[PDB]
Amino acid sequence: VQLLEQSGAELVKPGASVKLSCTASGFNIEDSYIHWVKQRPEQGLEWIGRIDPEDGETKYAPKFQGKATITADTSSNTAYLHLRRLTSEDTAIYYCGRGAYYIKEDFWGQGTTLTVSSASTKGPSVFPLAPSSKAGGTAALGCLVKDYFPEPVTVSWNSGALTSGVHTFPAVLQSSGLYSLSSVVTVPSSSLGTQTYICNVNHKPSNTKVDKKVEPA
Amino acid sequence: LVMTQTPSSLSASLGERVSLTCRASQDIGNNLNWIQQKPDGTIKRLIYATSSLDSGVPKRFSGSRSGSDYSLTISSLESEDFADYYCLQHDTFPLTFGGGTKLEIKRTVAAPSVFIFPPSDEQLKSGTASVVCLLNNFYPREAKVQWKVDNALQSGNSQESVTEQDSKDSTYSLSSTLTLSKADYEKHKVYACEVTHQGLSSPVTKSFNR
């Protein structure tokens, strides 16, 4: 029942500021040290700093000290990471990790993807990839998630009930400078005419949620 | 303080035993954890306080120092072990991570299942047509997908995407999406995807006629 849930992915203009969050659940946040770790695309993890929510005492890495400002709200049971004067070097996913008393009780948060761009958010267009395939009782189907920005998009199937065989490809960059990906899945052709296959796309940056039904023919 | 993690990359067979090392530049004592990042981005600490295993982490994971060299070791490698590993030192500020290690899994050659998807009508009406070619579960990564519209070889009008190694069978999957205007797609009829892989004796061609 105890976990760290981070705010949703978002886009922010350069020069601006953002305030990422990390809400502790199933335990009082001051009973631990809350760390903040950054990860630039195709790069390694970096420590930003840590807070003692009990009194708000914070320690930082040298490079982040003039931009980061970690805080907390004991009552809200949340720890925030505040970044000022945003730039392209700040586009990365930020993680909050717990530093509990009983060292054995440490765990991390899912992360918060932050894209810093001059452009605007654009939800995706979801077209279905119809079955009509033959491979020994196995048929492939899916969803083409086209023209969206920024990252990321999250695709699930049948609200999470279908997982076996699901392959969601990494987003590819297009000529328009917009991203596009497709998620596929194999299922037995024998179940095509009875089971309902729906993919669930979600793009937090633009608050869009699409549920496209993929039908046989 | 600089943690020097080595090797940067490592390809190992299943069942095999691997060790990743991190050379502490200024001595950090027993304050060094090992974290694992799965392909999906999720982070989970495996080893803490140099050798102590966290809750639930399988018996094949061990930690141990030897001078200024701290190491994580896996007695027998499994498919689910495919991930990126980083060593974290929490002795002196600023805390440091090693450059990481990308752990790939050597596997036996596997031929791909090929599928072809015609554009959806819902998109045709939008003015464009995306033809998708799926190469499911194969190994190794290399593959040569070629598009042929009315036996006409394509170029510059398609892009590919590849998934990372599967957690269960260590295979790869790849999609080649050929994009065209509603115009072009309506002009021609023969749409063919031609796959060429190590695991195939002859290049395979899946196709559909409009």
Binding site: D31, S32, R50, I103, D106 | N30, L95
Partner: peptide, 9 residues
């Protein structure tokens, strides 16, 4: 003795 974990509490 660490630096990641909270000593007190």
């Amino acid at each position: 003795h660490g630096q990641w974990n909270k000593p007190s509490k």
